[PDB]
Amino acid sequence: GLPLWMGTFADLMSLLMCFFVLLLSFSEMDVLKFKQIAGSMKFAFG
């Protein structure tokens, strides 16, 4: 199987995932910065 620290790591990663969606739920994003982020990602992926 996989080592138990893999489960610890997945648990911690998902816990930070919950934390950061909580943090973003009360934060407002930039508009032009996000549009340019999206453009760079669209260029990068094809």
Binding site: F34, A38, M41, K42, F45
Partner: protein, 209 residues
């Protein structure tokens, strides 16, 4: 929602068909269905029928087959061979069905994650609105959830149920074989009832007493 379960089950089937053919896959589904919409026969009724036939000298298909085989005229070892072959065949079918649903359980979460990664690719490649980024992710992540549910709440439970049904049929059929042997050899009913009562109280049944 619907496309997510479609992706998980399609990927699971696709990857699993390299281990089990469509014939074996449909056989496994048929075994699971027959174990789920039907009820196993309680060994108490089987013991009652065995003692009734022993004192005398049936709906149950194994019972009818064994009684017919013994009234046709055949050596003890021949009936032993036939009964053992039938019991082992049912055991093998149940083990292979458990294997099919175990393989579906093993493959389902990985395909949920593959669907999630494909969804995230398709989302980051078409990022247009921040307020709609969230639910889009939610749809992609949704696939993963189904994998988990199909891993722990569908395929693995049917694997467990088929294992349990396998033990139930093995116990019932072992009682049937012992009762048929006692019928052929003309044993005293008391000793055979003692053996059946001993056998009914071993294994996972032991907690009920």
């Amino acid at each position: 929602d619907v496309t997510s379960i479609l992706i998980v089950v399609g990927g699971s089937i696709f990857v699993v068909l390299m281990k089990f053919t469509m014939g074996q896959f449909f056989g496994a589904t048929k075994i699971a269905g027959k174990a789920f919409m039907f009820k196993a026969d309680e060994p108490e009724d089987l013991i009652a029928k065995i003692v009734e036939m022993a004192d005398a000298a049936i709906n149950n298909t194994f019972m009818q087959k064994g009684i017919d085989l013994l009234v046709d005229g055949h050596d003890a070892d021949v009936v032993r061979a036939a009964l053992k072959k039938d019991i082992a065949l049912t055991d093998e079918r149940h083990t292979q069905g458990t294997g099919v649903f175990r393989a579906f359980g093993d493959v389902a979460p990985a395909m949920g994650m593959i669907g999630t990664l494909v969804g995230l690719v398709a989302m980051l490649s078409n990022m247009d609105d921040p307020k709609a980024i969230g639910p889009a992710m939610a749809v992609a992540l949704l696939t993963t959830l189904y994998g988990a549910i199909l891993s722990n709440m569908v395929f693995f439970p049917i694997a467990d149920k088929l294992s349990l049904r396998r033990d139930q049929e093995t116990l019932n059929r072992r009682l049937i074989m012992d009762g048929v042997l006692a019928i052929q050899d003309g044993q005293n009913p008391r000793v055979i009832d003692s053996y059946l009562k001993n056998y009914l109280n071993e294994g996972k049944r032991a907690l009920e007493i």
